[PDB]
């Protein structure tokens, strides 16, 4: 709105509040990495994440042999040695050296004494491997190519109760398995059995009864039965059967025997629900009744009582001279039946069985088996359970213990078994694994923390093993510590890892959509082949947390989904969504983020509700209580939707006129959004969703002012800004912003920034100054838009193709820039060192043009495909030559050279011009005789920019001093600026206090530049083998050619067909002509209609812009023109300043229209807009035929549609090979377009030839073309001679297979 | 079929079949040295097993 919307006003449709604004889209990675690296004072750095976390986890490396420990106090981070601007060029690693302070003094001493001999601690500083820092954009630039780390999504480390839906069983039934999957430890299971026996298996080992694992713990004997089944008392054989009970359990039970009361009449014959019987028992002063043989007496029964729980015959011993409470309707005997299948009684037996199941084939002992079971689950380091797992277990099962214990508690297993036994009979609900509440996201922070913890554990083991050899007495620190014991573990994470992938830096939209990605693969995720069908499916809890519209349509579909626009992540790791809290009727204005698991026990009301009055008057607002949406009342509505654009991702939010196309087709349009190469001189779309400005200003692609000071001068390559209008005292003089020029991006595409401010034009802090790549006036752009006319044109657009005119190429609107950045090395060899020779032997003199004497092409030199970029010759050993070649050489007298031609050559392509060349030399020789002029020019440019910055700073200093001393003949006194030279001396103090800061700032700048020049003169480091390297930044300016892949804003795509002249195109009325002719047959097939409405709105706004620009052409600043401009726009449009003429210059190209995703313009709105624009209400206009000169006898649709230029170019896709390098072991042509690839003749392609009668085409295409090496040259000789014939004896692959089979015991010998 | 062609930069690149043959040759030589030295049956048995 400040300096962005004033230059170009964009009207917005829909009626939606804008109370809460979406946070920055890159806040996820930044907030995750900030928790790891605190970067604060010493008393700070208190949290469960970061290197300090693992350090406090295991700080002391103690040894019982010598009793020496290492203590941790704190760690400090140093400044980076190389900046990002030099790290990108030098191909270094951007990181900060880590330093930790460790004390070697140990409290333990000999003879059980107290303080050690050395009372004062060592307190030495030990160097550690640096960790890569995070740029403000979150790029993680470890090498010359920045690589970001995507977040991982895996199962939450909590207990789950999943039962199969009658599968993997002989008969229809459910298993009801329970898992205790921890964060870092062995997994546990309590799956049932078809025989109703509880079986426990640890880490998917051999199944054994859970009674053994229960006896292994402290609970032994009848304690396992007293805690699972209740006991009811009975009389010791009194008159009849006197059993004092109560009716809490007799409700709804089939009485097999007469349960009538001894003194009252009850226990009716039917005995159903027993509601009246329950009431009578409640009013009968108890549930006592008078009554068998089959009972498992759970009493803790040596003289009279014995083991086992069953009488079953006659109640022997006269009731031994409290039995059990287990019926067959509500409770089951599964736990009791498990005690009869196990043969282990003593705890030692269970321990031996567990040890045998864990470590098979080994004699178990009571000493070793006890430690194994104690370390398996009850160990701190062995069994780790995060706090989120403990809180999840407490939420699922109430325990009142969290954040204090990490190992599996002995009481938790009993509670889990009880819950499982309860859920087996019923009255329980299983927990789905696909629920979003049971899934947490692991960002880069937790992964890097785990990697650093593993590295620190390895380092601790190494230090403990090495501390025994060296004498601890009379020693010090920094020596008994490995230099790189864990630095490799952190360096391999960024280098080789499924999560950390290449950066998709193709445009400002891809830079912001690649960081909000949630992958499901990697170290601890389901493999693509093990995904299945349930993981790829979408769950109804993803509403507002995961946009189900942005997903790759390849094999890994449903696994690379991204987050929403308002979705966040809690401290635990769950996904959060904002929900505006609403009270009874009157909606509140306090938005609160509701988690996925917590939002289940609430009601949600959708947005777009009538809020004209204080409350919704419809009383039937559509809302989803829990998952499924049902029409609910206005009573007890607690949560309301915050905004309609909450369930869609940032990529899908840019699609204008959404909700009118198919769901599957909209998915393709999202993938094509982040695939358009940035075009030169692009513009914002006429019909935009409004989210483009936020995604443009949020992403790190455009510069933003940091202060309020005005601009001084814009030199194109660097913009200077004043200090501020309200700048602080003794602050920086002026803020200098250098805009990046044409430089190769990560995807081989140009990236440049252009200024937008002029002289003066005071800017407010936090405003975009210069646009980035593919951006204009701050608003995001992807490509130019042209007039479109849906109609078949002589079959040129028969299939899914597009036809364009030559007018689109004449203006050069779709042309882009590319950069290859070839490189070359100069590694030495055993038989002499290589050299960059200016002249290669036996080369033509004409090919040496545009080549410097050093051997590198000059900057700005035109090069063609197959040209010598860098002339390099390597020493070649003596090799035998054919006698005919020797005779020819002796005849001509020339001498054979001893060097081989290995100069770099441009591959087949457009062969653009050179941009920049960079050479690096070894430390031995730097600028001795090569690239001396390059270093001279570099130092001259450095001195020039230093002098310019010093001059501008001195000018600002003089201006500030003049404006400060003006209060107390200055123009005729140039030398009196720093010296008053007057009786007044009060201002001298302030003058000195300002001059000291100015001098220290100038000295800091000079010192920084001197360190820069010293680092440049010192020379960059290279691998030991190579001694010199050169890089050529060749750039190509590609244009739109036939065969290119051009896709629209929606899912519509298509290769560009043959371009026609301007006259052949359809001649519209008033002389205008269309630019593209799309096929209208894609509407019925692909259910997408938003493109038609988009075209109509584009035509309307283009007509409005054409009618408004003509009004100003008559007389500028006309009173009537402002009236029309205010009438057409929905009022902050009129401005008192003179900038109204500048707004008309932008509005002449069409007035921008901003339509929301869900609150877009309805049919009546677009109809009224078309009517006001002057176009016919139907939307279609009469169009003539330019090829013939006749008018079509039917109305046609024409309008402005947003078109993109996809990266699938035709020049990089075409490839043809005749004879290239063959394989090494197979002796076949190599594959891939890198170095003369060959189109693979697949197995399915061989079946096609076998289907036909062709037998000679398939015979020679498999033996003489690639397989046979002997007869491979015979066919070429026959072709070059003129005779068509070939002979194939046997392929090389069959010989290799025969040699392979002979290596084994098999004897494969040929016969006949 | 198990080449050891030197890649660009002086760093060789061999196939994984050389490791198995090298390990087999090393274990065979170790067993041959064990049989000549007249080692105990416990060590000679483990060598044959390996």
């Amino acid at each position: 709105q400040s300096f962005t919307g004033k230059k170009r006003i964009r009207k917005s449709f829909g009626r939606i509040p804008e109370a809460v604004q979406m946070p920055n889209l890159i806040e996820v990675q930044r907030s995750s990495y900030e928790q790891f690296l605190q970067r604060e004072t010493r008393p700070g750095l208190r949290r469960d994440e970061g290197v300090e976390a693992v350090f406090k986890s295991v700080f002391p490396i103690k040894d019982f042999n010598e009793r020496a420990v290492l203590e941790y106090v704190s760690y400090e981070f140093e400044e980076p040695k190389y900046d990002v601007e030099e790290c990108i060029q030098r191909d270094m690693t951007f990181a900060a050296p880590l330093k930790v302070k460790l004390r070697l003094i140990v409290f333990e001493t000999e003879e059980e004494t107290g303080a050690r001999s050395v009372k004062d601690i060592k307190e030495q500083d030990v160097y550690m491997g640096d960790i890569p820092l995070m740029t403000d954009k979150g790029t993680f630039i470890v090498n010359g190519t920045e690589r970001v780390i995507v977040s991982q999504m895996h199962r939450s480390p909590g207990v789950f109760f999943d039962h199969d839906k009658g599968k993997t069983h002989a008969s229809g039934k459910l298993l009801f398995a329970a898992r205790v999957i921890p964060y870092r430890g062995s997994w546990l299971d309590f799956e049932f059995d078809a025989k109703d026996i509880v079986y426990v298996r640890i880490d998917r080992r051999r199944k054994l009864p859970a009674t053994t694992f229960l006896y292994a713990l402290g609970m032994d004997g009848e304690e396992i039965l007293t805690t699972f089944y209740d006991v009811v008392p009975f009389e010791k054989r009194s008159g009849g059967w006197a059993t004092p009970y109560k009716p809490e359990r007799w409700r709804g039970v089939k009485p097999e025997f007469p349960l009538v009361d001894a003194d009252t009449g009850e226990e009716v014959a039917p005995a159903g629900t027993k509601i009246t019987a329950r009431q009578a028992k409640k009013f009968a002063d108890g549930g006592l009744k008078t009554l068998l043989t089959g009972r498992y007496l759970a009493r803790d029964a040596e003289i009279y009582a014995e083991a086992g729980d069953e009488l079953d015959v006659t109640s022997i011993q006269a009731l031994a001279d409290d039995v059990l409470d287990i019926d067959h309707v509500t409770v089951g005997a599964y736990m009791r039946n498990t005690l009869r299948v196990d043969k282990n009684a003593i705890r030692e037996d269970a321990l031996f069985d567990i040890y045998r199941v864990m470590r098979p084939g080994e004699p178990p002992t009571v000493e070793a088996a006890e430690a194994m079971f104690k370390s398996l689950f009850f160990d701190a380091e062995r069994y780790d359970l995060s706090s989120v797992g403990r809180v999840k277990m407490n939420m699922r099962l109430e325990q009142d213990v969290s954040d204090e214990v990490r190992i599996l508690r002995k009481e938790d297993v009993l509670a889990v078994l009880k819950v499982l036994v309860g859920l087996r009979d019923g009255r329980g609900e299983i927990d789905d694994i696909d629920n979003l509440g049971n899934r947490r996201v692991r960002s880069v922070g937790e992964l890097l923390e785990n990697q650093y913890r593993v590295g620190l554990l390895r380092m601790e083991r190494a230090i403990k093993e090495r501390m025994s050899s060296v004498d601890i007495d009379t020693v010090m620190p920094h020596d008994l510590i490995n230099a790189k014991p864990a630095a490799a573990a952190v360096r391999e994470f960024f280098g080789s890892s499924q999560l950390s992938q290449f950066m998709d830096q193709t445009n400002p939209l891809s830079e912001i959509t690649h960081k909000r990605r949630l992958s499901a693969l990697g170290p601890g995720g389901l493999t693509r082949e093990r995904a299945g069908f349930e993981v790829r499916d979408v769950h109804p809890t993803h509403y507002g947390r995961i946009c189900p519209i942005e997903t790759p349509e390849g094999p890994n579909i449903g696994l690379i989904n991204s987050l929403a626009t308002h979705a966040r992540v809690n401290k635990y790791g769950f996904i959060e969504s904002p929900y505006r809290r609403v009270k009874d009727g009157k909606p509140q204005d306090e938005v609160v983020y509701m988690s996925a698991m917590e939002e289940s026990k609430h009601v949600i009301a959708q947005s777009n509700i009538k809020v004209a009055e204080g409350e919704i008057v419809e009383d039937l607002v559509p809302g989803r209580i829990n998952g499924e949406p049902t029409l609910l009342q206005k009573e007890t509505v607690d949560l309301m939707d915050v905004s309609p654009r909450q369930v869609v991702s940032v990529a899908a939010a840019l699609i204008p006129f959404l909700e009118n196309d198919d769901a599957n087709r909209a998915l393709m349009g999202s993938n094509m959004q982040r695939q358009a190469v940035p075009l030169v001189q692009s513009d914002a779309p006429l019909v935009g969703t409004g989210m483009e400005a936020v995604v443009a200003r949020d992403s790190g692609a455009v510069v933003i002012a940091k202060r309020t000071g005005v601009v001084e001068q814009i030199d194109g390559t660097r913009i200077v800004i004043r200090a501020t209008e309200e700048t602080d005292p003794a602050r920086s003089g002026v803020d200098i912003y250098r805009m990046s020029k044409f430089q190769r991006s990560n995807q081989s595409t140009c990236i440049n920034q252009r200024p937008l401010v002029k002289v003066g034009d005071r800017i407010v802090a936090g405003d975009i100054i210069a646009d980035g790549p593919s951006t204009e006036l701050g608003e995001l752009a992807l490509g130019r838009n042209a007039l479109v006319a849906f109609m078949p044109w002589n079959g040129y657009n028969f299939e899914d193709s597009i036809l364009i005119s030559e007018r689109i190429v004449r203006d050069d609107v779709f042309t882009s820039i590319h950069i290859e950045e070839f490189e070359v090395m100069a590694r030495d060899t055993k038989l002499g060192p290589e050299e960059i020779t200016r002249d290669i032997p036996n080369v033509g003199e004409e090919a040496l043009r545009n080549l410097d004497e050093a051997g590198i092409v000059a900057i700005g030199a035109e090069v063609q495909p197959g040209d010598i970029l860098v002339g390099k010759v390597t020493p070649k050993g003596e090799s035998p030559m054919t006698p005919e070649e020797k005779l020819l050489r002796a005849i001509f007298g020339e001498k054979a050279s001893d060097v081989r031609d290995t100069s770099l050559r441009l591959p087949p392509g457009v062969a653009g011009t050179i941009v920049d060349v960079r050479v690096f030399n070894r430390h031995g020789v730097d600028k001795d005789e090569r690239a001396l002029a390059i270093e001279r020019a570099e130092i001259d440019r450095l001195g020039k920019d230093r002098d310019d910055e010093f001059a501008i700073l001195n000018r600002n200093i003089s201006g500030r001093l003049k404006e400060l001393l003006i209060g107390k003949l200055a123009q005729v006194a140039s030398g009196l600026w720093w010296q008053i030279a007057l009786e007044d001396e009060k201002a001298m103090g302030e003058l000195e206090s300002l001059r000291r800061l100015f001098d220290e700032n100038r000295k800091r700048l000079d010192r920084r530049f001197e360190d820069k020049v010293d680092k440049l003169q010192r020379g960059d480091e290279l691998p030991p083998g190579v001694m010199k390297m050169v890089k050529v930044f060749v750039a190509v300016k590609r244009k739109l050619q036939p065969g290119d892949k051009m896709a629209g804003r929606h899912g519509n795509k298509g290769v560009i067909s043959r371009i026609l002249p301007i006259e052949d195109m359809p001649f519209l009325a008033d002389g205008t002509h269309v630019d593209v002719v799309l096929n209208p047959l894609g509407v019925p097939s692909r259910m997408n209609v938003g493109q038609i409405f988009e075209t109509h709105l584009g035509w309307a706004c283009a007509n409005l812009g054409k009618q408004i620009t003509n009004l100003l052409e008559d007389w500028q600043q006309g009173g009537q023109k402002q009236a029309l401009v205010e009438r057409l726009t929905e009022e902050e449009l009129p401005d008192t300043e003179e900038g109204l003429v500048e707004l008309a210059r932008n509005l002449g190209k069409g007035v921008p229209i901003a339509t929301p995703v869900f609150d877009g313009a309805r049919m009546d709105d677009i109809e009224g807009h078309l009517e006001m624009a002057g176009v016919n209400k139907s939307g279609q206009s009469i169009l003539f035929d330019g090829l013939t000169g006749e008018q079509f006898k039917r109305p046609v649709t024409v309008g402005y549609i947003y078109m993109l230029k996809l990266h699938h170019l035709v020049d990089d896709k075409i490839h043809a090979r005749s004879i290239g390098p063959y394989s090494l072991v197979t002796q076949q042509p190599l594959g891939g377009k890198a170095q003369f690839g060959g189109q693979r003749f697949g197995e399915m392609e061989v079946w096609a030839l076998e289907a036909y009668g062709a037998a000679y085409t398939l015979q020679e295409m498999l033996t003489v073309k690639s397989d046979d090496v002997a007869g491979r040259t015979k066919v070429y000789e026959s072709i070059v001679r003129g005779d068509d014939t070939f002979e194939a004896g046997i392929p090389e692959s069959f010989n290799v297979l025969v040699k392979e089979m002979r290596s084994l015991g098999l004897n494969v010998e040929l016969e006949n | 079929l198990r080449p050891l062609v030197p890649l660009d930069g002086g760093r060789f690149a061999t196939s994984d079949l050389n490791d198995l043959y090298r390990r087999v040759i090393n274990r065979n030589n170790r067993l041959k040295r064990l049989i000549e030295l007249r080692a105990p049956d416990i060590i000679i048995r483990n060598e044959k097993r390996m």
Binding site: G361, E362 | R49, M50
Partner: peptide
């Protein structure tokens, strides 16, 4: 009683 480990059997 199956092991499938030569070093385990040796130890």
């Amino acid at each position: 009683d199956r092991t499938d480990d030569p070093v385990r059997m040796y130890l």
